[PDB]
PDB file of C-alpha atoms and ligand atoms in Angstrom:
ATOM      1  CA  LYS T   1     203.488  95.433 259.423  1.00  0.00           C
ATOM      2  CA  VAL T   2     204.439  95.621 263.185  1.00  0.00           C
ATOM      3  CA  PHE T   3     203.277  98.793 264.569  1.00  0.00           C
ATOM      4  CA  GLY T   4     204.811 100.792 267.176  1.00  0.00           C
ATOM      5  CA  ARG T   5     202.844 101.577 270.150  1.00  0.00           C
ATOM      6  CA  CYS T   6     202.500 105.278 269.644  1.00  0.00           C
ATOM      7  CA  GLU T   7     202.466 104.721 265.568  1.00  0.00           C
ATOM      8  CA  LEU T   8     199.348 102.726 266.269  1.00  0.00           C
ATOM      9  CA  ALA T   9     197.690 104.955 268.527  1.00  0.00           C
ATOM     10  CA  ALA T  10     197.689 107.695 266.197  1.00  0.00           C
ATOM     11  CA  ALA T  11     196.412 105.372 263.316  1.00  0.00           C
ATOM     12  CA  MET T  12     193.463 104.258 265.581  1.00  0.00           C
ATOM     13  CA  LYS T  13     192.812 107.754 266.579  1.00  0.00           C
ATOM     14  CA  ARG T  14     192.814 109.012 262.955  1.00  0.00           C
ATOM     15  CA  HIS T  15     190.484 106.084 262.080  1.00  0.00           C
ATOM     16  CA  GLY T  16     188.018 107.213 264.799  1.00  0.00           C
ATOM     17  CA  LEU T  17     188.708 104.691 267.498  1.00  0.00           C
ATOM     18  CA  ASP T  18     189.530 107.302 270.145  1.00  0.00           C
ATOM     19  CA  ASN T  19     186.767 106.808 272.784  1.00  0.00           C
ATOM     20  CA  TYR T  20     184.451 105.055 270.247  1.00  0.00           C
ATOM     21  CA  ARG T  21     181.571 103.694 272.247  1.00  0.00           C
ATOM     22  CA  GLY T  22     183.220 105.257 275.320  1.00  0.00           C
ATOM     23  CA  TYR T  23     186.515 103.189 274.935  1.00  0.00           C
ATOM     24  CA  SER T  24     189.605 105.507 275.526  1.00  0.00           C
ATOM     25  CA  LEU T  25     192.457 104.913 272.842  1.00  0.00           C
ATOM     26  CA  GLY T  26     194.403 103.255 275.441  1.00  0.00           C
ATOM     27  CA  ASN T  27     191.968 100.402 275.590  1.00  0.00           C
ATOM     28  CA  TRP T  28     192.270  99.884 272.067  1.00  0.00           C
ATOM     29  CA  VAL T  29     195.957  99.954 272.085  1.00  0.00           C
ATOM     30  CA  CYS T  30     196.197  97.454 274.917  1.00  0.00           C
ATOM     31  CA  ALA T  31     193.750  94.979 272.941  1.00  0.00           C
ATOM     32  CA  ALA T  32     195.817  95.037 270.077  1.00  0.00           C
ATOM     33  CA  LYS T  33     199.165  94.662 271.965  1.00  0.00           C
ATOM     34  CA  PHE T  34     198.021  91.329 273.706  1.00  0.00           C
ATOM     35  CA  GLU T  35     195.545  90.220 270.957  1.00  0.00           C
ATOM     36  CA  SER T  36     198.311  90.640 267.792  1.00  0.00           C
ATOM     37  CA  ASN T  37     201.733  92.063 269.507  1.00  0.00           C
ATOM     38  CA  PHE T  38     200.935  94.839 266.984  1.00  0.00           C
ATOM     39  CA  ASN T  39     201.594  92.702 263.917  1.00  0.00           C
ATOM     40  CA  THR T  40     198.728  93.291 261.171  1.00  0.00           C
ATOM     41  CA  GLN T  41     199.615  89.766 259.731  1.00  0.00           C
ATOM     42  CA  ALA T  42     199.008  87.808 262.738  1.00  0.00           C
ATOM     43  CA  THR T  43     196.294  84.786 262.387  1.00  0.00           C
ATOM     44  CA  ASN T  44     195.467  82.081 264.735  1.00  0.00           C
ATOM     45  CA  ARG T  45     193.198  79.226 264.450  1.00  0.00           C
ATOM     46  CA  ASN T  46     190.578  78.349 266.959  1.00  0.00           C
ATOM     47  CA  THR T  47     189.542  75.003 268.317  1.00  0.00           C
ATOM     48  CA  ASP T  48     186.157  75.364 266.532  1.00  0.00           C
ATOM     49  CA  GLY T  49     187.868  75.536 263.325  1.00  0.00           C
ATOM     50  CA  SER T  50     187.444  79.499 263.048  1.00  0.00           C
ATOM     51  CA  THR T  51     190.304  81.714 262.725  1.00  0.00           C
ATOM     52  CA  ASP T  52     191.220  85.010 264.152  1.00  0.00           C
ATOM     53  CA  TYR T  53     192.585  87.570 262.021  1.00  0.00           C
ATOM     54  CA  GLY T  54     194.777  90.824 261.962  1.00  0.00           C
ATOM     55  CA  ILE T  55     195.933  93.497 264.509  1.00  0.00           C
ATOM     56  CA  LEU T  56     192.518  92.929 266.734  1.00  0.00           C
ATOM     57  CA  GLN T  57     192.241  89.398 265.891  1.00  0.00           C
ATOM     58  CA  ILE T  58     188.735  89.444 264.309  1.00  0.00           C
ATOM     59  CA  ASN T  59     187.123  85.907 264.290  1.00  0.00           C
ATOM     60  CA  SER T  60     185.774  84.302 261.127  1.00  0.00           C
ATOM     61  CA  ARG T  61     183.172  82.743 263.456  1.00  0.00           C
ATOM     62  CA  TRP T  62     180.764  85.873 262.881  1.00  0.00           C
ATOM     63  CA  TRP T  63     182.827  88.778 261.297  1.00  0.00           C
ATOM     64  CA  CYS T  64     184.533  87.912 258.187  1.00  0.00           C
ATOM     65  CA  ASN T  65     184.644  85.170 255.234  1.00  0.00           C
ATOM     66  CA  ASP T  66     187.525  82.696 254.905  1.00  0.00           C
ATOM     67  CA  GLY T  67     185.370  80.134 252.976  1.00  0.00           C
ATOM     68  CA  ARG T  68     186.592  77.695 255.613  1.00  0.00           C
ATOM     69  CA  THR T  69     184.507  77.946 258.651  1.00  0.00           C
ATOM     70  CA  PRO T  70     181.343  76.040 258.118  1.00  0.00           C
ATOM     71  CA  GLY T  71     178.265  77.869 259.395  1.00  0.00           C
ATOM     72  CA  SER T  72     179.697  81.037 260.069  1.00  0.00           C
ATOM     73  CA  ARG T  73     178.666  84.445 259.529  1.00  0.00           C
ATOM     74  CA  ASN T  74     180.433  87.461 257.685  1.00  0.00           C
ATOM     75  CA  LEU T  75     178.868  90.591 259.712  1.00  0.00           C
ATOM     76  CA  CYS T  76     181.430  92.924 258.490  1.00  0.00           C
ATOM     77  CA  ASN T  77     181.054  91.912 254.800  1.00  0.00           C
ATOM     78  CA  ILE T  78     184.733  91.404 253.946  1.00  0.00           C
ATOM     79  CA  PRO T  79     187.085  88.629 253.136  1.00  0.00           C
ATOM     80  CA  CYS T  80     189.046  87.950 256.305  1.00  0.00           C
ATOM     81  CA  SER T  81     192.378  88.426 254.216  1.00  0.00           C
ATOM     82  CA  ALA T  82     191.477  92.307 254.129  1.00  0.00           C
ATOM     83  CA  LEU T  83     192.020  92.285 257.811  1.00  0.00           C
ATOM     84  CA  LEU T  84     195.647  91.637 257.347  1.00  0.00           C
ATOM     85  CA  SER T  85     196.568  94.846 255.770  1.00  0.00           C
ATOM     86  CA  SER T  86     199.200  97.070 256.712  1.00  0.00           C
ATOM     87  CA  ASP T  87     196.480  99.941 256.326  1.00  0.00           C
ATOM     88  CA  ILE T  88     194.200  99.336 259.563  1.00  0.00           C
ATOM     89  CA  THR T  89     191.243 100.800 258.192  1.00  0.00           C
ATOM     90  CA  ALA T  90     189.259  97.409 257.347  1.00  0.00           C
ATOM     91  CA  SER T  91     190.150  96.038 261.022  1.00  0.00           C
ATOM     92  CA  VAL T  92     188.822  99.432 262.559  1.00  0.00           C
ATOM     93  CA  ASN T  93     185.667  99.389 260.595  1.00  0.00           C
ATOM     94  CA  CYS T  94     184.879  95.858 261.570  1.00  0.00           C
ATOM     95  CA  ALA T  95     185.774  96.570 264.936  1.00  0.00           C
ATOM     96  CA  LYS T  96     183.181  99.396 265.586  1.00  0.00           C
ATOM     97  CA  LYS T  97     180.646  96.977 264.625  1.00  0.00           C
ATOM     98  CA  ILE T  98     182.068  94.385 267.179  1.00  0.00           C
ATOM     99  CA  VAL T  99     182.290  96.730 269.900  1.00  0.00           C
ATOM    100  CA  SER T 100     178.652  97.829 269.230  1.00  0.00           C
ATOM    101  CA  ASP T 101     177.395  94.208 269.205  1.00  0.00           C
ATOM    102  CA  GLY T 102     176.438  94.440 272.750  1.00  0.00           C
ATOM    103  CA  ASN T 103     179.094  93.283 275.172  1.00  0.00           C
ATOM    104  CA  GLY T 104     181.340  96.193 274.201  1.00  0.00           C
ATOM    105  CA  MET T 105     185.237  95.085 274.278  1.00  0.00           C
ATOM    106  CA  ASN T 106     184.492  91.995 276.245  1.00  0.00           C
ATOM    107  CA  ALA T 107     184.344  90.442 272.964  1.00  0.00           C
ATOM    108  CA  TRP T 108     188.227  90.485 272.731  1.00  0.00           C
ATOM    109  CA  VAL T 109     188.979  87.994 275.354  1.00  0.00           C
ATOM    110  CA  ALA T 110     192.462  89.438 275.829  1.00  0.00           C
ATOM    111  CA  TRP T 111     190.962  93.085 276.425  1.00  0.00           C
ATOM    112  CA  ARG T 112     188.855  91.534 279.078  1.00  0.00           C
ATOM    113  CA  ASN T 113     191.566  89.457 280.906  1.00  0.00           C
ATOM    114  CA  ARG T 114     194.469  91.509 280.317  1.00  0.00           C
ATOM    115  CA  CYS T 115     193.208  95.302 279.738  1.00  0.00           C
ATOM    116  CA  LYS T 116     189.995  95.622 281.249  1.00  0.00           C
ATOM    117  CA  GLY T 117     190.274  97.809 284.658  1.00  0.00           C
ATOM    118  CA  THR T 118     193.688  98.698 284.362  1.00  0.00           C
ATOM    119  CA  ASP T 119     195.743 101.716 283.770  1.00  0.00           C
ATOM    120  CA  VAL T 120     195.164 101.802 279.910  1.00  0.00           C
ATOM    121  CA  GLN T 121     196.310 105.266 279.770  1.00  0.00           C
ATOM    122  CA  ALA T 122     199.818 104.031 279.970  1.00  0.00           C
ATOM    123  CA  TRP T 123     199.577 102.786 276.373  1.00  0.00           C
ATOM    124  CA  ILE T 124     199.196 105.995 275.026  1.00  0.00           C
ATOM    125  CA  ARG T 125     201.672 107.896 277.410  1.00  0.00           C
ATOM    126  CA  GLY T 126     204.413 109.973 275.453  1.00  0.00           C
ATOM    127  CA  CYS T 127     202.470 109.587 272.469  1.00  0.00           C
ATOM    128  CA  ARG T 128     202.267 112.662 269.940  1.00  0.00           C
ATOM    129  CA  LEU T 129     198.701 111.935 269.027  1.00  0.00           C
TER     130      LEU T 129
HETATM  131 CL1   CL E   1     204.819  97.972 273.319  1.00  0.00          CL
HETATM  132 CL1   CL E   2     190.676 108.372 273.790  1.00  0.00          CL
HETATM  133 CL1   CL E   3     193.547 105.801 277.376  1.00  0.00          CL
HETATM  134 CL1   CL E   4     182.947  79.945 255.727  1.00  0.00          CL
HETATM  135 CL1   CL E   5     176.685  86.589 256.883  1.00  0.00          CL
HETATM  136 CL1   CL E   6     196.573 102.553 259.023  1.00  0.00          CL
HETATM  137 CL1   CL E   7     180.473  99.250 276.701  1.00  0.00          CL
HETATM  138 NA1   NA E   8     182.693  83.615 258.640  1.00  0.00          NA
END
């Protein structure tokens, strides 16, 4: 599923992401935009052989099992395929663990490079939340 901007903001808020670990809703929408272009089905291979999955491009190196990332962990305790659903619940629950892991939203490279320090409120502007 390809989410609309406000549609995803609302779903994220409903799943508890708004101000989660101090990160306003716009930060999450911005991260999703640049990670997956709001596409729940997005997958991308990394050079180390891991794969990024879903709306928030969660990495099989640490967070989910895809059975093809040697030596990797599965800290969210889920198959990576569960991160590709039209329902964002699994991605959001895993994201909560990731953003609590120590480096905050810097874990998402696109967030750090494209969202961090910017006017992220613009991502929820106009949205009926
Ligand atoms: Cl957009
Ligand atoms: Cl918020
Ligand atoms: Cl915001
Ligand atoms: Cl594996
Ligand atoms: Cl594990
Ligand atoms: Cl959803
Ligand atoms: Cl933080
Ligand atoms: Na893994």
